[PDB]
Design a binder for this molecule. Sequence first.
Ligand code: SFG
Ligand code: ZN
Ligand code: ZN
Ligand code: ZN
Length: 468
Amino acid sequence: MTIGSMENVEVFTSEGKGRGLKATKEFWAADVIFAERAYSAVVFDSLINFVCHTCFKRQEKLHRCGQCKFAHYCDRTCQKDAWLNHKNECAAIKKYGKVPNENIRLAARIMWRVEREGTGLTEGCLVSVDDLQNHVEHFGEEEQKELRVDVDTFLQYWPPQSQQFSMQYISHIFGVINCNGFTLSDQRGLQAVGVGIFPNLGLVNHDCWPNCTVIFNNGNHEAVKSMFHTQMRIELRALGKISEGEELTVSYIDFLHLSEERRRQLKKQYYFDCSCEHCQKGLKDDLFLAAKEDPKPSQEVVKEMIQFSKDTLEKIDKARSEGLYHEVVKLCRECLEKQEPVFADTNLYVLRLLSIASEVLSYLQAYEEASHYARRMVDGYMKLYHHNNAQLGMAVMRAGLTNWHAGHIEVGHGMICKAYAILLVTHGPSHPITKDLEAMRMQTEMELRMFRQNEFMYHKMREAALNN
Ligand SMILES: Nc1ncnc2c1ncn2[C@@H]1O[C@H](C[C@@H](N)CC[C@H](N)C(=O)O)[C@@H](O)[C@H]1O
Ligand SMILES: [Zn+2]
Ligand SMILES: [Zn+2]
Ligand SMILES: [Zn+2]
């Protein structure tokens, strides 16, 4: 169907969850419930000269805008498509002679658009940008002060010839940005490169074990104009069967934390007490802090082990933050060794170490060791995550690659295939990441075939040498 259309959903009022979205029909895993273009989006301050301001792709050669020396693009093409939103901030930045906060730039794009369209409601919309939820009234002292400063900078940056908004509406737009931004990723889903506002997605509530997942698709342009699958957009996809009338939900955080831990994060960032089934029953918590059972550690050998792991981790962080990779590995091996007799492999402290060890070892190009930890982590992840979870998918793809690089083609291809299957649900066939994985699956198939033929030839050799 088409980007912007919300037919498959309708707004409705929840108990204490305020507004929510429900399916107007039946859905199956991988179905695109709806797509949506960003109402406004900006590049993070860190990455102003390394990411396209139109499409958010990383690239070795970008072309800066001769007029402001701020905006960068992949092509004159991405530069043209950006003009509509960039005209005003370009001319506005030259006048300010400084580049404002990323929040400030975003707030300005939102208001320039409200002005341009003389309204905050978009034609696709269930909600106008200014009616999104804003928890400003619960912002901490630092949060509030932070907002006063940006409003002031905003005022000096905001063109005098542009529609003047009241301070109340302005601080409100800032509140909305803090409680509604969607992080944007480069085309490889490697690093967060920007923040965007997607109104419709803004009506979907949270659940630690959601029935929907969201993906940002950078889009592509190579001949053949106006095509749904190549348009920059975010999509809300079904992770499984969703009945008509069922409320749609996504997860605001990563699932790999204790229910108490998740509630704390959700309460702090989204001012609410999560009441999903997983948090109320503490589902998976036993697995999250699983101890072994052949010997069965005492209640105290565990408490010491968790404390020790908590200790090792932060220590590993420091070292990693200083580029001391070998030290990081050393610390990981030692802790994993001590954990073996106590924790099972679904225990979050074990998994954390495996993921870290596997990452650094891969970076150090020690693929053989990395592939072992990578396999263990995937096996543990498989018992915790929803089988169509995007993080699980991305993690399996990575473990698959490390195994491939180490020469373990059988295990590599298998993992790559499992990842591809998951990504087809969470990212779709047209996503940049799904395409790179498909290309990888193709290469591993051929290498596996070459591996299997080599073996069958040794069998034909033994055959002939024996006369069957
Ligand atoms: N499971 C939940 N239980 C209670 N409140 C929630 C839940 N999930 C989201 N919310 C609330 O919804 C806010 C974010 C919105 N993007 C979601 C739709 C919102 N319910 C609305 O009326 O616009 C959060 O900051 C919470 O205040
Ligand atoms: Zn671009
Ligand atoms: Zn410019
Ligand atoms: Zn929950």
